[PDB]
């Protein structure tokens with residue numbers, strides 16, 4: 055129906071407002087924030103940095119973010135709840151698995167993984183009672199056997215609960231096509247799926263064909279760019295060397311092709327990032343001081359100046375996330 | 385003179401009969417708290433561990449060293465709970481095993497050193513419980529990241545006096561590469577136990593390590609898949625040699641004059657999610673004695689082979705005390 059799970063409890067979807075559909079409070083690893091908080095200075099410092107950042111995003115018009123950190127990205131839902139409340143910004147938590155499953159996950163069957171995802175959606179995450187409102191999955195270009203289990207478990211959990219699925223792709227590898235085939239083999243509707251990191255490629259043929267099938271297209275890393283940082287290999291590898299404008303122009307491109315309803319936009323920002331090289335967070339913040347406010351402050355005016363009507367931009371940042379997040383079918 | 389446990393410091397005289405390589409639960413970081421139903425429930429797992437420790441205690445055991453690291457899903461709050469209920473001392477570990485997540489795998493030796501030091505000097509998580517041992521693991525030749533872990537472990541040991549204990553593939557003589565790295569760092573072999581050393585019959589490999597002053601961890605004695613050789617996963621994990629065959633290594637090293645260098649354990653667990661489903665049931669049917677296997681089966685087996693009480697007490701009480709007591713000499 056029209057209620058979704060947030061880390062402060064259930065809300066009606068009209069309350070979500072401007073929603074960033076792919077963000078992170080902290081990109082980490084299972085257990086890591088609690089075992090080694092000084093990696094982030096302190097847990098308090100991290101929380102305060104996130105509260106400041108979310109408050110700025112709120113001032114810029116953001117009302118909800120979707121934290122697509124899974125278990126193996128070190129999702130700490132107690133932290134998400136703390137910062138959501140202090141910033142007074144809705145946060146939707148995720149279940150699923152990303153690219154770093156530990157052995158206790160890697161060795162599980164599709165049936166076992168289905169029950170883990172269902173636990174996090176239907177019962178709660180850890181002992182917090184906080185329930186996930188979305189399932190996040192990730193694959194390499196060519197889907198591994200384990201990753202295929204994860205996608206099937208995600209599809210089964212979605213069909214059982216109605217909560218949507220969102221993905222990490224290598225867009226230069228057209229990763230969404232293999233994901234989509236697996237999802238549809240499970241009877242999952244494309245309208246319950248966002249193919250993410252789709253702004254990492256300029257292949258409009260790939261993008262429009264997925265959109266034509268009813269998939270949501272995640273243009274979710276707009277401010278990611280290492281232009282000017284070419285001498286930094288780790289930052290280049292992570293952020294790419296296409297401009298944020300180049301990424302943003304894909305939003306216009308899909309609108310022009312008639313697929314405004316299939317677009318979801320985000321920053322894929324974080325306030326801490328331990329699952330990459332040390333100090334990457336400082337590099338990212340030096341490139342994009344706006345953080346999660348980058349979409350409303352820079353991208354929206356960029357799009358309006360290009361001639362895209364207000365109603366279309368509002369449709370993308372409010373209506374599309376609302377349809378996507380509302381639990382649908384069963 | 386003082387050893388840190390999950391209930392606080394104890395004097396070496398308090399440690400008594402100590403099992404130096406054990407696990408309450410072999411898991412993954414965050415896993416027990418994210419999916420306790422994998423083990424039935426957290427309560428079920430705790431209760432199994434308390435009964436298990438009480439059985440070990442009734443067989444004479446007074447302390448175990450839980451060598452579960454961060455990435456083996458060590459939950460020291462669980463360790464504290466079961467230690468208290470069973471009245472058995474538990475020494476917690478820092479270090480890294482074979483499943484480091486990205487947030488660990490991407491770290492420098494300097495960063496890893498600070499993490500190991502934090503868990504020894506400050507406490508684990510926000511519990512104030514301090515590690516009393518550093519556990520490391522290698523495969524084969526030693527990977528570049530594993531080398532960083534071993535060096536970080538040596539540096540944390542050298543700063544604190546806390547000993548290092550290892551996981552090897554003994555069939556690949558893996559202790560040799562570990563020893564080389566430790567010695568390059570200035571670490572005394574008397575601070576190092578080369579573990580899973582009972583997984584080979586190469587006595588020349590073992591005695592040579594002992595002769596250099598390493599402790600030899602004969603720590604997986606009941607691990608055997610005899611009869612289960614058509615169970616591939618059990619066979620790869622548990623091996624095809626009998627427990628008597630493993631146990632005879634203890635006698636062999638004593639007869640070579642190295643009783644002071646021997647540490648014995650079960651390497652048991654009460655839950656095990658970082659392997660195939662139902663492995664705990666397979667393991668429990670193979671060794672229904674659990675952590676009581678060493679005192680109930682191995683000690684009488686050695687006594688019947690003519691090893692005197694004084695020697696067995698030196699191995700199970702004196703050697704662990706000397707090893708665990710923090711020392712920079």
Ligand SMILES: C[As](C)(=O)[O-]
Pocket residue numbers: 081127222322
């Ligand atoms: C945590 As990411 C760089 O896959 O959005």
Ligand SMILES: C[As](C)(=O)[O-]
Pocket residue numbers: 410456551651
């Ligand atoms: C957790 As193990 C089988 O390396 O002792």
Ligand SMILES: [Zn+2]
Pocket residue numbers: 222223251
């Ligand atoms: Zn991603």
Ligand SMILES: [Zn+2]
Pocket residue numbers: 076077078122322
């Ligand atoms: Zn992301």
Ligand SMILES: [Zn+2]
Pocket residue numbers: 521551552580
């Ligand atoms: Zn081991």
Ligand SMILES: [Zn+2]
Pocket residue numbers: 405406407451651
């Ligand atoms: Zn072990």
